[PDB]
Amino acid sequence: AQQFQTIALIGIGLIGSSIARDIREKQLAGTIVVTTRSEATLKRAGELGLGDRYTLSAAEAVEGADLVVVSVPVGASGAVAAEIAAHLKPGAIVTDVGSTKGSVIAQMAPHLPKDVHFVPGHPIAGTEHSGPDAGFAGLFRGRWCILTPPAGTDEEAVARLRLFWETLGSMVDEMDPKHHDKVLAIVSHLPHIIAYNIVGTADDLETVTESEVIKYSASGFRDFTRLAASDPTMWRDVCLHNKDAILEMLARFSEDLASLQRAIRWGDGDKLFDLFTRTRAIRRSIVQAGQDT
Amino acid sequence: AQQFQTIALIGIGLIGSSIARDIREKQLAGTIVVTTRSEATLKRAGELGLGDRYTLSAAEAVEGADLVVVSVPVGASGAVAAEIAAHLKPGAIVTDVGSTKGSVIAQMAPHLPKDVHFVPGHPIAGTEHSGPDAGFAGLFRGRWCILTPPAGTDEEAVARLRLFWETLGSMVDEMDPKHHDKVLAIVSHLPHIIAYNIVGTADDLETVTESEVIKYSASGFRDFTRLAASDPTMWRDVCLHNKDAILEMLARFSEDLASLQRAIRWGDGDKLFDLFTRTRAIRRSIVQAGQDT
Numbered sequence: 001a002q003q004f005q006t007i008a009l010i011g012i013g014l015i016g017s018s019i020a021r022d023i024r025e026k027q028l029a030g031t032i033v034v035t036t037r038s039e040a041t042l043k044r045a046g047e048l049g050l051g052d053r054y055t056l057s058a059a060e061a062v063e064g065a066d067l068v069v070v071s072v073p074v075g076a077s078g079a080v081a082a083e084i085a086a087h088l089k090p091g092a093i094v095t096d097v098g099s100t101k102g103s104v105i106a107q108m109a110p111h112l113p114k115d116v117h118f119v120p121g122h123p124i125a126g127t128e129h130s131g132p133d134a135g136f137a138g139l140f141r142g143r144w145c146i147l148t149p150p151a152g153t154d155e156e157a158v159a160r161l162r163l164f165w166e167t168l169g170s171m172v173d174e175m176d177p178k179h180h181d182k183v184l185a186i187v188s189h190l191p192h193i194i195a196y197n198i199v200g201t202a203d204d205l206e207t208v209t210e211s212e213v214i215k216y217s218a219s220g221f222r223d224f225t226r227l228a229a230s231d232p233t234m235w236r237d238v239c240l241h242n243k244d245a246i247l248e249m250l251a252r253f254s255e256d257l258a259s260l261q262r263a264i265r266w267g268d269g270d271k272l273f274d275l276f277t278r279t280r281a282i283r284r285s286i287v288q289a290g291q292d293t
Numbered sequence: 294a295q296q297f298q299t300i301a302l303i304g305i306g307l308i309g310s311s312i313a314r315d316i317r318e319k320q321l322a323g324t325i326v327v328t329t330r331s332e333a334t335l336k337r338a339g340e341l342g343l344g345d346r347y348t349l350s351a352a353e354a355v356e357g358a359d360l361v362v363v364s365v366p367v368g369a370s371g372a373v374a375a376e377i378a379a380h381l382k383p384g385a386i387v388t389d390v391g392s393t394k395g396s397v398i399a400q401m402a403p404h405l406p407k408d409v410h411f412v413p414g415h416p417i418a419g420t421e422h423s424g425p426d427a428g429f430a431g432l433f434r435g436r437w438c439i440l441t442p443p444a445g446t447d448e449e450a451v452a453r454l455r456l457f458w459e460t461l462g463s464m465v466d467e468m469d470p471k472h473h474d475k476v477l478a479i480v481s482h483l484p485h486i487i488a489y490n491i492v493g494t495a496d497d498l499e500t501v502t503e504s505e506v507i508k509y510s511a512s513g514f515r516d517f518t519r520l521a522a523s524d525p526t527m528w529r530d531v532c533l534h535n536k537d538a539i540l541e542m543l544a545r546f547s548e549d550l551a552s553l554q555r556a557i558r559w560g561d562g563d564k565l566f567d568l569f570t571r572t573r574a575i576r577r578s579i580v581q582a583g584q585d586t
């Protein structure tokens with residue numbers, strides 16, 4: 001079943017460890033090499049049996065690796081690329097899984113040598129949990145993964161990465177990085193930002209107690225709390241590195257909310273009914289597509 | 294197991310039909326009487342076996358009923374109270390399940406006679422689906438229900454309604470209707486309004502296609518689409534009937550979002566990290582309480 005003789009995983013949290021478990025289950029690698037920055041996380045990965053070889057040095061980890069998967073918060077991407085650059089073998093494929101792509105490409109590509117193939121990726125799959133114990137086999141089954149190869153990228157390298165993600169159970173699409181960043185700003189980043197904002201709002205109230213919010217959360221609030229429990233480093237970094245697309249979507253959202261607020265202020269039941277009717281269609285399409293939870 | 298000789302259910306959608314199924318499973322009624330406004334819904338309720346007696350007339354339905362449960366969109370509450378008032382027996386208990394309470398009390402109480410007991414309720418439990426086929430036994434298990442009896446309400450009537458909800462598996466709290474409406478504005482109404490708004494925003498884009506939004510919805514958007522698939526009549530009515538509390542929470546939310554937008558604009562990573570850290574605590578409390586989905 002092997003697709004790569006050696007796969008090096010740099011970062012071994014939710015995504016990296018889920019990839020590790022799938023590689024083991026599908027026998028996709030001759031050798032899995034695991035690296036992460038801390039001794040504590042590396043030890044956990046060892047106790048979990050996520051790799052065959054382990055190291056604290058990303059430079060050492062990539063020596064002789066055919067595929068290098070970088071699964072770290074996006075603001076760390078450049079530092080990883082700088083540390084591994086000199087140690088990559090000719091023809092290595094370097095990929096990532098970052099939630100932003102334009103930034104990652106800009107941060108990493110200046111460090112990477114001409115003889116390696118850089119094929120950025122993004123699996124459209126996750127949970128609110130983090131670290132190696134949070135990962136599991138099958139996270140990517142029936143999900144989409146987006147690749148964003150720069151112009152002139154080796155087409156065989158792209159095909160091998162497409163096959164890899166398909167083997168993990170994903171459907172694969174390719175797009176330009178700027179388009180990726182616009183699409184993800186609305187389908188992912190804005191939803192998280194808005195969830196953080198509403199949970200912060202509720203926390204700040206004096207008249208309604210924390211106990212009340214918790215007790216009665218099954219009337220809608222709980223759904224937003226799940227997203228707002230995600231890792232703060234990950235989401236800090238997305239906001240810092242997809243700024244322009246996020247700000248565009250926030251401005252659209254806030255224009256629309258002013259109009260909805262005015263319909264509520266003026267008791268415009270017909271406008272409210274029309275908005276609430278229009279939104280149902282999207283859910284029905286998601287359900288028919290099998291993308292619902 | 295009987296708690297009431299005759300229970301009349303006015304409205305037989307998600308909530309009314311879930312109550313009907315629980316009454317049957319727990320043997321809580323001598324007779325279940327079902328009424329709803331349309332022949333189509335009444336026929337469905339009959340095919341499902343939700344009642345013992347069926348009628349299109351709410352006035353007829355309540356004749357001799359010990360407990361009358363009104364489960365209709367909140368803007369219909371007054372019309373129901375007006376139709377049944379003259380037909381209620383002395384000592385009947387009239388309750389409702391509306392998502393707002395101040396409005397329901399104001400609309401219903403002027404019609405109801407001095408000899409009946411009015412004990413408004415709200416089960417903090419539901420799904421995004423509607424109608425009799427959407428209901429199920431066990432919807433209320435491990436959920437909260439809030440009662441909002443006006444001052445001077447018969448304490449034995451309140452106790453019987455508390456016992457009824459406890460038997461359906463709920464924990465029961467009592468509060469003032471205005472406080473209810475403030476609490477629900479943040480834990481339920483604002484979350485739904487914001488979900489409708491974000492799904493509307495995404496729908497309006499030209500650069501990102503409907504197909505893209507659907508395909509990549511597992512990156513966060515799908516959670517909001519579930520709420521925005523709810524019944525438009527129900528949610529139109531909540532916005533019309535909890536206006537003041539909703540507008541207060543919308544203004545708090547929008548003040549907070551301006552500040553978050555400014556942190557993103559200025560690249561204030563430390564502020565973002567602090568907000569995203571603070572919100573995790575609420576989720577952990579919900580999980581420990583067992584209120585998570």
Ligand SMILES: NC(=O)c1ccc[n+]([C@@H]2O[C@H](COP(=O)([O-])OP(=O)(O)OC[C@H]3O[C@@H](n4cnc5c(N)ncnc54)[C@H](OP(=O)(O)O)[C@@H]3O)[C@@H](O)[C@H]2O)c1
Pocket residue numbers: 010011012013014015016036037038039041042071072073074076079097098099100122123124125126127128129130131132231234
């Ligand atoms: N979570 C999701 O749902 C999801 C989905 C798709 C894509 N992604 C993207 O996947 C990437 C990884 O996310 P994740 O959820 O797997 O995160 P995670 O569970 O928090 O794992 C983070 C990993 O990155 C390491 N790390 C953290 N800061 C680092 C730094 N400054 N330099 C080097 N390594 C560092 C951690 O090592 P130590 O523990 O040893 O410090 C750990 O190995 C992110 O770019 C995220 O945007 C996430």
Ligand SMILES: NC(=O)c1ccc[n+]([C@@H]2O[C@H](COP(=O)([O-])OP(=O)(O)OC[C@H]3O[C@@H](n4cnc5c(N)ncnc54)[C@H](OP(=O)(O)O)[C@@H]3O)[C@@H](O)[C@H]2O)c1
Pocket residue numbers: 303304305306307308309329330331332334335364365366367369372390391392393415416417418419420421422423424425524527
């Ligand atoms: N859905 C939830 O999650 C949830 C949770 C807690 C509380 N509630 C509250 O429960 C109440 C009922 O909600 P639901 O979800 O059960 O709704 P639903 O499934 O849409 O059922 C609506 C019921 O009300 C009837 N109805 C509609 N408009 C009416 C009118 N103008 N006059 C008289 N009857 C009318 C319908 O009869 P026909 O079908 O014959 O027209 C049907 O029997 C609402 O006040 C809602 O706010 C809902």
Ligand SMILES: N[C@@H](Cc1ccc(O)cc1)C(=O)O
Pocket residue numbers: 098099123124125126127128188230511512513
């Ligand atoms: N973590 C998100 C999903 C997600 C997927 C991809 C991302 O890039 C970000 C988030 C959730 O639990 O729903």
Ligand SMILES: N[C@@H](Cc1ccc(O)cc1)C(=O)O
Pocket residue numbers: 218219220391392416417418419420421481523
């Ligand atoms: N229908 C909501 C829950 C809810 C509960 C009580 C309400 O009054 C309103 C909504 C959901 O599916 O999550």
Ligand SMILES: [Cl-]
Pocket residue numbers: 003004005006066
């Ligand atoms: Cl190979």
Ligand SMILES: [Cl-]
Pocket residue numbers: 296297298299359
């Ligand atoms: Cl009785």
Ligand SMILES: [Mg+2]
Pocket residue numbers: 059083086
């Ligand atoms: Mg070196």
Ligand SMILES: [Mg+2]
Pocket residue numbers: 085086087088089090113
């Ligand atoms: Mg070299």
Ligand SMILES: [Mg+2]
Pocket residue numbers: 085110111
């Ligand atoms: Mg260099």
Ligand SMILES: [Mg+2]
Pocket residue numbers: 252255256497
């Ligand atoms: Mg608009």
Ligand SMILES: [Mg+2]
Pocket residue numbers: 352376379
């Ligand atoms: Mg009459």
Ligand SMILES: [Mg+2]
Pocket residue numbers: 378379380381382383406
């Ligand atoms: Mg009378």
Ligand SMILES: [Mg+2]
Pocket residue numbers: 378403404
């Ligand atoms: Mg009268």
Ligand SMILES: [Mg+2]
Pocket residue numbers: 204545548549
């Ligand atoms: Mg504030």
